[PDB]
Amino acid sequence: DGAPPIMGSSVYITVELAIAVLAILGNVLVCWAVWLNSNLQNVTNYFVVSLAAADIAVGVLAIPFAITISTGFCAACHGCLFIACFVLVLTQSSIFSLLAIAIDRYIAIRIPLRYNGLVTGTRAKGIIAICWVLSFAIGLTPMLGWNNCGQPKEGKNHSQGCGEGQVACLFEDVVPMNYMVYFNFFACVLVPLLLMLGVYLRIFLAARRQLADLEDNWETLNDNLKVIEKADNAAQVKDALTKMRAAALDAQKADFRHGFDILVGQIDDALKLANEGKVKEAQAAAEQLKTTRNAYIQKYLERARSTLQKEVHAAKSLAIIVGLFALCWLPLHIINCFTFFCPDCSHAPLWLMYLAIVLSHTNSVVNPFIYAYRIREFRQTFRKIIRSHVL
Ligand SMILES: CC(C)CCC[C@@H](C)[C@H]1CC[C@H]2[C@@H]3CC=C4C[C@@H](O)CC[C@]4(C)[C@H]3CC[C@]12C
Ligand SMILES: CC(C)CCC[C@@H](C)[C@H]1CC[C@H]2[C@@H]3CC=C4C[C@@H](O)CC[C@]4(C)[C@H]3CC[C@]12C
Ligand SMILES: CC(C)CCC[C@@H](C)[C@H]1CC[C@H]2[C@@H]3CC=C4C[C@@H](O)CC[C@]4(C)[C@H]3CC[C@]12C
Ligand SMILES: Nc1nc(NCCc2ccc(O)cc2)nc2nc(-c3ccco3)nn12
């Protein structure tokens, strides 16, 4: 019978409302930016908007629900559940959006060739609708009978003076911890997180191998070239050109058709000279390759390299989003593991719980900062919106 609970409550409520303000405003800005900047209207950013929608709803609904449930007010058992579990629906929706973004970027880097034919806005819209419906079904599963409404706290319900059937609106009293640990954490959160880790691993490895391939083809072009200038045999020259020719048309698979046709044509010219024993003609006809290389091949192998670099830098930016999600949500999941798995442990203290709850809510405010910071197109669009509207 120490400090009045209203004092602790005041800090918690004030902080929660400060978070709600920032989650709403920042994520409204993201949606506004995607709405009037056609450079941002792609499939990838439709999942960004779905993710922003979930974070707006955290400020508008989940946080007010969190404040309400903290009071332990007397209400319907299934009413409490909805208040208690709605945040999950939003958290699950966030998981699906993050997973979809990963797969989208994976498809884009491995088969850029058939990316626009496979991944369309119409199909993305259908994927998003389905994921929202699945998120409701997963998040509100306790309302289907997996709850403690059948086992009410006799003592608490009489202390608070609830009516008949009514019950305080506690979180750990109505939502079973085996649902939270096994179903929600392990299956619905941790498994998708590990899948996202895997997808991003492949993204970075695919980028690393492609770059390499081009570097190998580029060095193959120039070495076989230097072998040409020193050889003394007709077949010695013909060997370095057939190997230079394979590397020519393979680098071609990674306006510019002209650059590669002059190159491969010049190699074939030098080939028939070599076959007819005309060594010095072959060596001199192969020496004009280096100006075709310096006027086309070099120009395309820098441009392909900078495109891959941008895809890597973009993938890193999106991976940070997933990292901060895990950082904000793992403490709460870990606390629940201790509650569930260690009955010999005294329960984590109230101040720590609420610190972990506050931390999970702040994850819906760092997003917009990552965007404007990591992605130029977002930053420039926010700049314009801020400077124009409503000034
Ligand atoms: C976005 C719009 C829909 C506003 C959010 C709708 C919310 C506020 C609605 C949907 C279901 C409603 C709840 C349904 C059941 C109960 C149990 C009752 O003993 C107290 C009221 C309470 C807790 C209701 C409060 C309001 C409620 C939570
Ligand atoms: C990135 C992933 C693996 C994070 C999840 C790690 C979790 C599941 C690990 C990390 C530390 C572990 C806990 C360490 C201590 C205890 C106390 C013991 O009496 C019950 C098990 C329990 C509660 C462990 C359960 C599993 C645990 C919570
Ligand atoms: C994933 C990263 C952030 C590590 C997680 C840090 C926090 C959440 C971890 C580190 C040490 C953990 C605590 C270790 C000891 C106890 C005492 C036990 O009676 C209740 C759980 C509690 C209070 C644990 C809760 C979770 C905990 C506080
Ligand atoms: N354990 C828990 N508690 C609460 N609220 C109740 C906090 C509490 C803690 C102790 C106590 O005696 C009474 C109430 N919300 C919670 N949300 C979550 C959660 C959300 C997502 C994953 O876990 N876990 N969680």
XYZ file of C-alpha atoms and ligand atoms in Angstrom:
500
model
C 0.000 0.000 0.000
C 2.592 2.525 -1.323
C 2.561 5.089 -4.189
C -0.916 5.798 -5.612
C -1.301 3.923 -8.910
C -2.620 7.087 -10.671
C 0.908 8.609 -10.591
C 2.486 5.785 -12.583
C -0.603 5.728 -14.823
C -0.221 9.428 -15.650
C 3.271 8.936 -17.045
C 2.237 5.864 -19.033
C -0.882 7.472 -20.554
C 0.951 10.697 -21.436
C 3.755 8.751 -23.149
C 1.285 6.544 -25.033
C -0.611 9.535 -26.344
C 2.647 11.227 -27.395
C 3.465 8.065 -29.360
C -0.011 7.984 -30.927
C 0.445 11.564 -32.204
C 3.769 10.746 -33.842
C 2.539 7.395 -35.308
C -0.471 9.067 -36.934
C 1.288 12.123 -38.311
C 4.392 10.365 -39.679
C 2.441 7.612 -41.398
C -0.187 9.942 -42.845
C 2.824 11.696 -44.466
C 3.960 8.409 -46.043
C 0.525 7.767 -47.550
C 0.267 11.374 -48.776
C 3.701 11.062 -50.454
C 2.792 7.856 -52.293
C -0.547 9.384 -53.380
C 0.864 12.317 -55.420
C 4.338 11.162 -56.507
C 3.994 8.706 -59.395
C 7.659 7.691 -58.993
C 6.568 6.142 -55.654
C 3.517 4.376 -57.116
C 4.940 0.891 -57.587
C 4.060 -2.510 -56.155
C 6.768 -2.340 -53.486
C 5.335 0.892 -52.030
C 1.772 -0.472 -51.959
C 3.012 -2.794 -49.230
C 4.699 0.266 -47.660
C 1.263 1.946 -47.622
C -0.378 -1.161 -46.134
C 2.341 -1.112 -43.453
C 1.651 2.606 -42.824
C -2.090 1.871 -42.553
C -1.412 -0.628 -39.783
C 0.743 1.947 -37.957
C -1.913 4.673 -38.264
C -4.357 2.207 -36.708
C -1.931 1.664 -33.825
C -2.234 5.362 -32.949
C -5.950 5.658 -33.636
C -7.121 2.329 -32.102
C -4.471 0.051 -30.534
C -3.013 2.681 -28.179
C -6.454 3.815 -26.951
C -7.231 0.089 -26.492
C -3.963 -0.378 -24.557
C -4.817 2.541 -22.231
C -8.328 1.140 -21.688
C -7.160 -2.391 -20.851
C -4.598 -1.141 -18.318
C -7.349 0.054 -15.985
C -8.711 -3.482 -15.492
C -12.249 -2.189 -16.086
C -15.231 -4.533 -15.807
C -16.639 -5.567 -19.185
C -17.737 -8.509 -21.331
C -15.251 -11.378 -21.582
C -15.442 -11.292 -25.387
C -15.516 -7.535 -25.368
C -12.245 -7.537 -23.424
C -10.762 -10.045 -25.792
C -11.416 -7.803 -28.776
C -9.852 -4.875 -26.949
C -6.912 -7.082 -25.890
C -6.271 -8.822 -29.212
C -6.849 -6.138 -31.842
C -3.226 -5.018 -31.639
C -2.244 -8.486 -32.843
C -4.307 -8.072 -36.007
C -2.223 -4.988 -36.723
C 1.053 -6.686 -35.785
C 0.250 -9.653 -38.015
C -0.627 -7.322 -40.906
C 2.785 -5.694 -40.460
C 4.481 -9.120 -40.672
C 2.757 -9.943 -43.951
C 3.664 -6.556 -45.462
C 7.318 -6.933 -44.481
C 7.435 -10.472 -45.861
C 5.809 -9.371 -49.115
C 8.330 -6.529 -49.544
C 11.202 -9.005 -49.135
C 9.817 -11.436 -51.709
C 9.086 -8.541 -54.088
C 12.700 -7.375 -54.011
C 13.909 -10.977 -54.317
C 11.828 -11.515 -57.460
C 13.124 -8.158 -58.804
C 16.844 -9.039 -58.485
C 16.821 -12.698 -59.638
C 14.383 -12.441 -62.575
C 14.179 -8.728 -63.458
C 13.396 -9.957 -66.961
C 9.931 -11.257 -66.056
C 9.200 -8.997 -63.093
C 6.687 -6.598 -64.644
C 4.707 -9.500 -66.171
C 4.545 -11.449 -62.886
C 4.192 -8.721 -60.214
C 1.408 -6.259 -61.062
C -0.540 -3.687 -59.020
C -3.779 -5.622 -59.525
C -2.228 -8.798 -58.093
C -0.594 -6.842 -55.232
C -4.017 -5.374 -54.305
C -5.445 -8.898 -54.084
C -2.478 -10.108 -52.001
C -2.967 -7.205 -49.577
C -6.718 -7.837 -49.132
C -6.069 -11.538 -48.429
C -3.344 -10.726 -45.902
C -5.649 -8.324 -43.989
C -8.335 -11.002 -43.756
C -5.795 -13.604 -42.570
C -4.481 -11.056 -40.027
C -7.969 -10.674 -38.500
C -8.352 -14.467 -38.323
C -4.946 -15.003 -36.699
C -5.147 -11.994 -34.353
C -8.683 -12.698 -33.134
C -8.306 -16.507 -32.785
C -8.784 -16.263 -28.992
C -12.358 -15.047 -29.666
C -12.990 -18.448 -31.328
C -12.705 -20.228 -27.944
C -8.971 -20.247 -27.117
C -9.295 -18.028 -24.049
C -9.641 -17.996 -20.261
C -13.225 -16.646 -20.224
C -14.215 -20.095 -18.938
C -11.823 -19.745 -15.955
C -12.439 -16.285 -14.417
C -10.536 -14.804 -11.487
C -13.141 -15.131 -8.703
C -11.253 -12.650 -6.427
C -10.537 -9.851 -8.935
C -14.081 -9.832 -10.361
C -15.577 -9.295 -6.892
C -12.897 -6.775 -5.808
C -13.553 -4.515 -8.803
C -17.286 -5.157 -8.291
C -18.096 -6.361 -11.788
C -21.590 -7.465 -12.621
C -22.445 -11.094 -13.243
C -20.376 -12.720 -15.981
C -18.324 -9.542 -16.296
C -14.573 -9.533 -15.662
C -11.775 -7.010 -15.144
C -10.060 -6.208 -18.366
C -6.719 -7.705 -17.770
C -4.510 -9.038 -20.565
C -2.863 -12.005 -18.841
C -6.217 -13.014 -17.291
C -8.225 -13.451 -20.527
C -5.560 -14.332 -23.111
C -3.867 -17.681 -22.497
C -0.055 -17.613 -22.523
C 0.255 -20.849 -24.576
C -1.521 -19.050 -27.456
C 0.870 -16.113 -27.141
C 4.036 -18.185 -26.976
C 3.396 -21.147 -29.251
C 0.866 -19.777 -31.721
C 1.609 -16.046 -31.909
C 5.347 -15.833 -31.157
C 6.883 -19.052 -32.562
C 4.538 -19.676 -35.486
C 3.176 -16.252 -36.477
C 6.113 -13.913 -35.681
C 9.403 -15.765 -35.297
C 8.996 -18.088 -38.280
C 8.168 -15.262 -40.738
C 11.081 -13.219 -39.334
C 13.492 -16.068 -40.036
C 12.028 -16.401 -43.541
C 12.640 -12.678 -44.128
C 16.220 -13.201 -42.898
C 16.596 -15.986 -45.455
C 15.152 -13.990 -48.330
C 17.435 -11.021 -47.642
C 20.459 -13.371 -47.373
C 19.701 -14.627 -50.887
C 19.204 -11.043 -52.097
C 22.673 -10.000 -50.991
C 24.239 -13.221 -52.274
C 22.549 -12.920 -55.674
C 23.856 -9.349 -56.002
C 27.354 -10.438 -54.995
C 27.410 -13.269 -57.605
C 26.120 -11.166 -60.444
C 28.597 -8.393 -59.881
C 31.260 -11.039 -59.790
C 30.094 -12.618 -63.014
C 30.422 -9.266 -64.840
C 33.838 -8.685 -63.252
C 34.926 -12.126 -64.472
C 33.553 -11.490 -67.944
C 35.250 -8.054 -67.984
C 38.639 -9.453 -66.952
C 38.168 -12.378 -69.384
C 37.705 -9.748 -72.127
C 40.909 -7.873 -71.267
C 43.161 -10.773 -70.454
C 42.358 -12.686 -73.632
C 43.030 -9.309 -75.338
C 46.568 -9.034 -73.858
C 47.181 -12.702 -74.765
C 46.426 -11.728 -78.389
C 49.177 -9.060 -78.550
C 51.940 -11.430 -77.315
C 51.052 -14.711 -79.116
C 53.048 -15.993 -82.069
C 50.762 -18.775 -83.386
C 47.545 -18.554 -85.408
C 45.641 -21.041 -83.191
C 47.074 -19.344 -80.050
C 45.230 -16.195 -81.168
C 42.081 -18.133 -82.206
C 41.886 -19.712 -78.733
C 41.921 -16.325 -76.933
C 39.140 -15.002 -79.245
C 36.738 -17.948 -78.910
C 37.067 -17.544 -75.119
C 36.676 -13.778 -75.558
C 33.574 -14.391 -77.716
C 31.778 -16.542 -75.105
C 32.409 -13.910 -72.419
C 31.157 -11.301 -74.921
C 27.622 -12.683 -75.460
C 27.181 -13.832 -71.831
C 27.928 -10.349 -70.455
C 25.348 -9.326 -73.084
C 22.760 -11.148 -70.906
C 22.905 -9.045 -67.693
C 20.780 1.247 -77.960
C 23.402 -0.905 -76.334
C 22.649 -3.771 -78.770
C 24.811 -1.739 -81.194
C 27.815 -1.759 -78.816
C 27.798 -5.540 -78.427
C 27.188 -6.201 -82.144
C 30.248 -4.168 -83.155
C 32.243 -6.117 -80.545
C 31.095 -9.630 -81.467
C 31.328 -8.761 -85.183
C 34.920 -7.559 -84.710
C 35.772 -10.818 -82.943
C 34.291 -12.922 -85.778
C 36.241 -10.812 -88.314
C 39.433 -11.553 -86.375
C 38.417 -15.241 -86.154
C 38.267 -15.978 -89.923
C 41.621 -14.207 -90.322
C 43.041 -16.508 -87.638
C 41.597 -19.628 -89.326
C 43.276 -18.624 -92.612
C 46.668 -18.363 -90.846
C 46.724 -14.547 -91.195
C 48.200 -13.991 -87.725
C 49.319 -10.370 -87.911
C 46.054 -9.374 -89.612
C 44.160 -11.120 -86.788
C 46.271 -9.358 -84.119
C 45.751 -5.945 -85.775
C 42.033 -6.526 -86.457
C 41.662 -7.590 -82.798
C 43.429 -4.389 -81.655
C 40.465 -2.215 -82.732
C 38.385 -4.087 -80.085
C 39.787 -1.854 -77.342
C 38.144 1.292 -78.761
C 34.811 -0.549 -79.071
C 35.347 -1.658 -75.456
C 36.213 1.903 -74.380
C 33.175 3.358 -76.232
C 30.460 0.878 -75.289
C 31.353 -2.155 -73.225
C 32.875 -0.096 -70.357
C 29.892 2.285 -70.421
C 27.382 -0.573 -69.983
C 29.345 -2.541 -67.352
C 29.511 0.686 -65.165
C 25.781 1.238 -65.602
C 24.848 -2.372 -64.762
C 27.136 -2.204 -61.708
C 25.498 1.004 -60.386
C 22.030 -0.490 -60.899
C 23.006 -3.519 -58.788
C 24.548 -1.231 -56.150
C 21.239 0.683 -55.894
C 19.274 -2.566 -55.488
C 21.656 -3.602 -52.681
C 21.407 -0.187 -50.984
C 17.590 -0.294 -51.269
C 17.447 -3.843 -49.877
C 19.613 -2.760 -46.914
C 17.226 0.112 -46.204
C 14.225 -2.248 -46.153
C 16.086 -4.814 -44.008
C 16.591 -2.124 -41.357
C 12.786 -1.800 -41.183
C 12.536 -5.513 -40.325
C 15.396 -5.200 -37.812
C 13.731 -2.386 -35.898
C 10.448 -4.316 -35.906
C 12.167 -7.257 -34.210
C 13.945 -4.978 -31.716
C 10.694 -3.281 -30.600
C 8.636 -6.484 -30.354
C 11.092 -9.155 -29.105
C 11.277 -7.908 -25.474
C 7.527 -8.379 -25.008
C 7.678 -11.865 -26.581
C 10.721 -12.737 -24.397
C 8.974 -11.567 -21.230
C 6.021 -13.761 -22.108
C 8.428 -16.715 -22.561
C 9.669 -16.246 -19.003
C 6.124 -15.972 -17.666
C 5.136 -19.151 -19.514
C 8.208 -21.365 -19.213
C 9.414 -20.434 -15.691
C 6.710 -20.866 -13.031
C 9.510 -20.740 -10.429
C 10.301 -17.171 -11.601
C 8.567 -14.186 -10.004
C 6.664 -12.296 -12.660
C 8.361 -9.485 -14.541
C 7.552 -6.223 -12.710
C 4.718 -3.938 -13.792
C 6.985 -1.025 -14.784
C 8.926 -3.377 -17.117
C 5.877 -4.708 -18.727
C 4.625 -1.244 -19.549
C 8.078 -0.193 -20.734
C 8.009 -3.139 -23.180
C 4.453 -2.250 -24.281
C 5.527 1.363 -24.881
C 8.578 0.104 -26.798
C 6.429 -2.092 -29.110
C 4.227 0.946 -29.855
C 7.159 3.187 -30.781
C 7.933 0.902 -33.736
C 5.085 2.645 -35.557
C 6.972 5.948 -35.631
C 10.503 5.045 -36.719
C 9.383 3.873 -40.162
C 8.820 7.279 -41.796
C 12.227 8.336 -40.424
C 13.942 5.359 -42.109
C 12.272 6.302 -45.401
C 13.163 9.984 -45.575
C 16.626 9.031 -44.381
C 17.390 6.057 -46.597
C 15.332 6.677 -49.725
C 15.906 9.849 -51.746
C 12.540 9.783 -53.547
C 10.678 9.748 -50.208
C 12.887 12.447 -48.661
C 12.402 14.811 -51.614
C 8.615 14.222 -51.574
C 8.334 14.932 -47.849
C 10.413 18.065 -48.410
C 7.902 19.336 -50.977
C 4.858 18.406 -48.869
C 6.280 20.076 -45.757
C 7.429 23.252 -47.514
C 4.262 23.691 -49.560
C 1.523 22.446 -47.262
C 0.167 24.244 -45.582
C 2.599 27.177 -45.623
C -12.892 2.258 -35.332
C -14.258 2.306 -34.657
C -15.060 1.045 -34.959
C -14.118 2.517 -33.154
C -13.571 1.267 -32.476
C -14.693 0.289 -32.147
C -14.631 -0.143 -30.687
C -14.459 1.061 -29.768
C -15.865 -0.953 -30.302
C -15.968 -2.265 -31.082
C -16.467 -3.331 -30.105
C -16.844 -2.551 -28.854
C -16.800 -3.285 -27.524
C -17.683 -4.523 -27.530
C -17.788 -5.111 -26.140
C -17.584 -4.396 -25.018
C -17.834 -5.071 -23.688
C -18.647 -4.160 -22.776
O -18.741 -4.749 -21.474
C -17.952 -2.809 -22.674
C -17.901 -2.139 -24.041
C -17.097 -2.959 -25.043
C -15.627 -2.956 -24.641
C -17.248 -2.325 -26.424
C -16.535 -0.967 -26.479
C -16.493 -0.343 -27.873
C -15.913 -1.360 -28.837
C -14.525 -1.780 -28.354
C 15.800 -14.876 -31.807
C 14.955 -15.832 -30.975
C 15.649 -17.181 -30.820
C 14.626 -15.228 -29.615
C 13.942 -16.251 -28.715
C 14.885 -16.728 -27.616
C 14.105 -17.258 -26.419
C 13.026 -18.239 -26.861
C 15.040 -17.897 -25.397
C 16.172 -16.961 -24.975
C 16.381 -17.154 -23.471
C 15.513 -18.354 -23.121
C 15.004 -18.465 -21.695
C 16.140 -18.457 -20.685
C 15.624 -18.779 -19.299
C 14.486 -19.463 -19.074
C 14.143 -19.825 -17.647
C 13.712 -21.284 -17.560
O 13.246 -21.565 -16.235
C 12.590 -21.532 -18.557
C 13.088 -21.301 -19.978
C 13.540 -19.859 -20.191
C 12.331 -18.934 -20.132
C 14.197 -19.754 -21.567
C 13.154 -19.928 -22.679
C 13.697 -19.669 -24.085
C 14.361 -18.307 -24.099
C 13.348 -17.244 -23.671
C 16.029 -9.107 -27.057
C 16.867 -8.190 -26.173
C 16.234 -6.808 -26.064
C 17.080 -8.804 -24.795
C 15.825 -8.676 -23.941
C 16.071 -7.768 -22.742
C 15.051 -8.031 -21.639
C 13.633 -8.041 -22.198
C 15.360 -9.334 -20.908
C 16.811 -9.406 -20.431
C 16.798 -10.056 -19.045
C 15.365 -10.536 -18.867
C 14.835 -10.673 -17.449
C 15.699 -11.603 -16.610
C 15.037 -11.889 -15.279
C 13.712 -11.777 -15.073
C 13.161 -12.200 -13.729
C 11.924 -13.068 -13.913
O 11.329 -13.329 -12.637
C 10.925 -12.336 -14.798
C 11.519 -12.106 -16.183
C 12.766 -11.231 -16.125
C 12.376 -9.816 -15.714
C 13.405 -11.200 -17.513
C 12.519 -10.429 -18.500
C 13.163 -10.204 -19.869
C 14.521 -9.564 -19.659
C 14.351 -8.258 -18.885
N 2.010 -10.060 -21.104
C 1.292 -9.024 -21.601
N 0.541 -8.247 -20.776
C -0.188 -7.202 -21.253
N -0.927 -6.444 -20.414
C -1.017 -6.793 -19.010
C 0.243 -6.410 -18.245
C 0.173 -6.974 -16.844
C 1.316 -7.490 -16.246
C 1.253 -8.009 -14.957
C 0.045 -8.012 -14.269
O -0.018 -8.521 -13.006
C -1.098 -7.496 -14.867
C -1.034 -6.977 -16.156
N -0.162 -6.933 -22.581
C 0.599 -7.732 -23.369
N 0.789 -7.669 -24.708
C 1.637 -8.702 -24.957
C 2.117 -9.006 -26.334
C 1.724 -8.279 -27.436
C 2.397 -8.894 -28.477
C 3.154 -9.947 -27.975
O 2.980 -10.023 -26.603
N 2.022 -9.440 -23.891
N 1.311 -8.751 -22.910
